[PDB]
Amino acid sequence: TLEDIENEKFTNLEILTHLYNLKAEIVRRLAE
Amino acid sequence: KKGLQGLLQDIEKRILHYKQLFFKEQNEIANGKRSMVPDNSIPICSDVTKLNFQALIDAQMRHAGKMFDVIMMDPPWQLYDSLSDEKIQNMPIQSLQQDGFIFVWAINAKYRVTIKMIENWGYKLVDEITWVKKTVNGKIAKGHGFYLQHAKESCLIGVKGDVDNGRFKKNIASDVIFSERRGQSQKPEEIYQYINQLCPNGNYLEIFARRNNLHDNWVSIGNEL
Amino acid sequence: GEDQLSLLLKWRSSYIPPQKPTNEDEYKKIICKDISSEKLEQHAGDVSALFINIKWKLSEGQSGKSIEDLKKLAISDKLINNGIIFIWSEKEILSQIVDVLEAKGFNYIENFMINQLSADKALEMQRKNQIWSDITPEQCIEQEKFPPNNYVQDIFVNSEYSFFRKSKKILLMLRKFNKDAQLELRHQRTSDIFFDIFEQNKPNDVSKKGMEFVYKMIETLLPKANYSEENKGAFKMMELYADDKSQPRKGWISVYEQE
Amino acid sequence: PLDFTQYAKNMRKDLSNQDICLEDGALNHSYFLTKKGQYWTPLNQKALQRGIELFGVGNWKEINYDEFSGKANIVELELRTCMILGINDITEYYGKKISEEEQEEIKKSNIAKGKKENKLKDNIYQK
Ligand SMILES: Nc1ncnc2c1ncn2[C@@H]1O[C@H](CSCC[C@H](N)C(=O)O)[C@@H](O)[C@H]1O
């Protein structure tokens, strides 16, 4: 979900780590 | 799966936007950006059970010519990391001050033991500063306890040595702070204003500080500093 | 009337002191020569609220009692044994008060303070900012007419002190726990801080409504200590250093000094 | 009376950590502009540069477990490598084993070509 990763109490670095982890998981789902 | 492809495109756009935001932040930081911490702040990031207080004693003696005038602590009372009452007692506060004041913020469960703490450190309890929690509309931000609703935080003050030497002022500020809750354990900046009224241009020590506690002419010690 | 002073003093409309009872069976008024030298277990027993309405001397010029007077005062087990002591604390002698009371089995459990607001400072702020040209601060207390202050921290009763100025009145609460009985309590029924108006020259004189707020705090925290038909001749609420201003109260034992 | 600037500088010099204060005792504001636990010290930057010299770009796992001891974000390693190479999307350099001098050469030519294309945002060539 983008809500848990777009919180304003999260810095840009942890936001980007959340984005990249979500990207890896959904790329795995795409390959599935 | 067209929906997952669209979501992948969406998070790729968010990755690019936040990548640009991160690059802007790191370019500003590396060039000239200054933090909210004042320039004359002295932050020490150490555990007080592992901190060599002798080094602080020697540095304060050689760099200021005297000892601290005000010591303030917001102890992690046992109910971030917490500390035992004996562990807070074991801190060599007696060596850190010869003349001046101590400011120990006491929760209701650790109020009498705070009084005993400042007595056992050589201070004599002469004052307390109570922070009344405030709402946005100006009322009292009521909480919870076992007998009464807790809407207060008390900072018990013990005095030491020869305070009447022209460094400390009398009949100043107030013993009541009426400030909003601006954090979780974040005590107001009015305690720092009141301390600076008590000892203007003095040497202050803060134990159990966070990054919001860093002030001018303050030596601040904390686990997360 | 939505300013800060009007909002923080709105409890006064709901804490009017009641009339003193004409029923002799609804209280116990006791006149003593020296409370600290008086045996109180013959006057009461198993009380749950020992409100010590003490005035402290602090400075030698003024009157009041002392820590030695609190030391000499005997609070036995045949007196309050499962209950709360409510005692007016001072910053200078808070450590001595808790020491002498924990000597008598009473452990600190709660802090109940009155934020001292000044009617004379509120009146002077209204006069400096500008019906209020000629009104006494005592009249402001009694007529409930207050200036519309929106920043009350400027009208705190910042009384003279050698340190941070004294702008609060602490009513220390100390419990003597009983392992054989249970103190029937109501929890979180009232806040530990309430703003009440004071006079500049009388920072230690709690108003009628503030005293009623204190009494209702005591009587709400301990309802079984209230005036019930089972508590007739066996009242569970006692006051030391009583005054004729508020203490002839239902379900209360009033102990006066040298009437 | 004492001046508190020099006093604070000396107290930070002998008491504060190397991340809190600079070499002259001045406060390191970059430390307090990031959350605690993730600062990216100059030692971290040097370790990242050593990893790019020794291992290829995009090899953040073996960079992290040979120069950061596994206490670094792979995302942050990629972002820092993007900053020191000048492209938001480091795709051409994936697995190239770029040394220090070549890293600076790519960064300089990259900033120059970003100025040529008129798309430089934060000294990073936008795609
Ligand atoms: N052993 C220890 N040594 C040093 N700091 C410690 C510690 N144990 C806990 N702390 C720190 O003490 C602090 C207690 S909370 C302090 C709140 C602060 N006064 C404010 O106004 O915001 C936390 O930062 C906690 O991490």
Q: What DSSP line would sit under B182-212, residue for residue?
A: -SSS---THHHHHHHHHSTT--EEEES--GG
Token pair of B98 as six digits: 């010869």
Give the chain D residue whose CA is nearest to the CA of B30. D30
Q: How far apart are CA B143 and CA B152, in angstroms?
A: 9
The string of DSSP letters for C150-188 reads S-GGGSB--B--SSB-B-EEEEEEEEE--SSS------S
Q: How far apart are CA C52 and CA C38, in angstroms?
A: 14
Q: How far apart are CA B161 and CA B184, in angstroms?
A: 34
Q: Is the dihedral of CA D31, D32, D34, D35 positive or negative?
A: positive
Asked if residue B174 has its Cβ within 6 Å of ligand 1, the reply is no
Q: What angle do CA B61, B67, B72 make, to 5 degrees?
A: 135
Q: Please report, for residues B107, B122, B198, C117, the alpha-carbon distance to residue B156 in angstroms, rounded to integers and kept in the order given.
A: 10, 14, 15, 21
CA A32 to centroid of chain Cα atoms:
19
Q: In what order do the strands lie in the sheet with B218-222?
A: B42-45, B218-222, B204-207, B70-73, B100-106, B152-160, B124-134, B176-180
Q: How far apart are CA B28 and CA B34, in angstroms?
A: 9
The string of DSSP letters for B32-81 reads T---SS-TT-EEEE--TTT--HHHHHHHHHHHHSS--SEEEE---B----
Q: How far apart are CA B180 and CA B133, in angstroms?
A: 5
Residue given tokens 């001397």 in the structure block: C57
8 Å CB contact of B7 and A12: no
The minimum-distance atom of ligand 1 relative to the CA of B183 is: 22
A30 contacts B5 by C-beta, under 8 angstroms = yes
Token pair of C26 as six digits: 């609804």
**Alpha carbon of B3 to ligand 1 centroid (Å):** 47
Q: How far apart are CA C54 and CA C64, in angstroms?
A: 8
Q: Which of B105, B107, B108, B111 is nearest to B147 (CA)?
A: B108
Q: How far is B115 from chain C (nearest CA, A)?
A: 7
Token pair of B140 as six digits: 């009292």
Q: Return the number of other C-beta atoms located less than 10 Å from residue B96's C-beta.
A: 20
Q: How far is A27 from chain B (nearest CA, A)?
A: 8
Whole-angstrom distance between the N-terminal and C-terminal Cα of chain C? 43
Mutation site, B2, B5, B8, interface A, largest A CB count within 10 A: B8
| B191-197 contacts at long range (C-beta below 8 A, 24 or more positions apart) | B191/B72, B191/B103, B191/B129, B191/B131, B191/B155, B192/B218, B194/B129, B194/C164, B195/B70, B195/B72, B195/B103, B197/B169, B197/B172, B197/B173
Mutation site, D75, D81, D90, interface A, largest A CB count within 10 A: D75
B178 contacts B134 by C-beta, under 8 angstroms = yes
Q: Which residues contact B199 (CB under 8 A, 6 or more apart)?
A: B69, B70, B100, B101, B167, B168, B169
Q: Is the dihedral of CA D15, B197, C60, B113 positive or negative?
A: negative
Q: Which of B83, B76, B101, B40 is nearest to B209 (CA)?
A: B76
Measured in degrees and rounded to the nearest 5, phi and psi for residue B95 equal: -75, -25
Q: Look up residue B163 and give its DSSP letter.
A: -
Q: Return the number of other C-beta atoms located less than 10 Å from residue C54's C-beta.
A: 20
Q: Look up residue C56 and give its DSSP letter.
A: B
CA C19 to centroid of chain Cα atoms:
18
8 Å CB contact of A17 and D34: no
Token pair of B174 as six digits: 């107030």
Asked if residue B48 has its Cβ within 6 Å of ligand 1, the reply is yes
HEC assignment per residue over chain D: CCCHHHHHHHHHHHCCCCCCECCCCCECHHHHCCCCCCCCCHHHHHHHHHHHHHCCECCHHHHHHHHCCCCCCHHHHHHHHHHHHCECCCCCCECCCCCHHHHHHHHHHHHHHHHHHCCECCCCECC
Asked if residue B179 has its Cβ within 6 Å of ligand 1, the reply is no
Give the chain D residue whose CA is nearest to the CA of B51. D15
Q: Determination method here?
A: cryo-EM
Residues recorded for chain D: 127
8 Å CB contact of D75 and A11: no
Q: How far apart are CA D78 and CA D88, in angstroms?
A: 10
Amino acid, res. C132:
W
SS3 A19: helix
Q: What angle do CA B84, B85, B86 make, to 5 degrees?
A: 90
Q: Is the dihedral of CA C2, C5, C11, C12 positive or negative?
A: negative
Q: Is the dihedral of CA B42, B48, B53, B55 positive or negative?
A: negative
Q: Is the dihedral of CA A13, A17, A18, A22 positive or negative?
A: positive
Give the chain B residue whose CA is nearest to the CA of C9. B139
Q: Look up residue A5 and give its DSSP letter.
A: T
Q: Is the dihedral of CA B105, B107, B109, B112 positive or negative?
A: positive
Strands B100-106 and B70-73, bridge-based pairing: parallel
- Measured over all CA atoms, what is the biggest interatomic distance in chain A, rounded to whole angstroms? 33
D111 contacts D86 by C-beta, under 8 angstroms = yes
Residues facing C254 on adjacent strands: C29, C239
CA B24 to centroid of chain Cα atoms:
31
Q: How far apart are CA C136 and CA C145, in angstroms?
A: 11
Token pair of B119 as six digits: 């007595």
CA C140 to centroid of chain Cα atoms:
21
B217 is in an annotated binding site: no
8 Å CB contact of B42 and D26: no
In angstroms, this model's resolution equals 2.5
Q: How far apart are CA C51 and CA C80, in angstroms?
A: 11
Q: Which of D111, D46, D107, D105 is nearest to D72 (CA)?
A: D46
Asked if residue B186 has its Cβ within 6 Å of ligand 1, the reply is yes
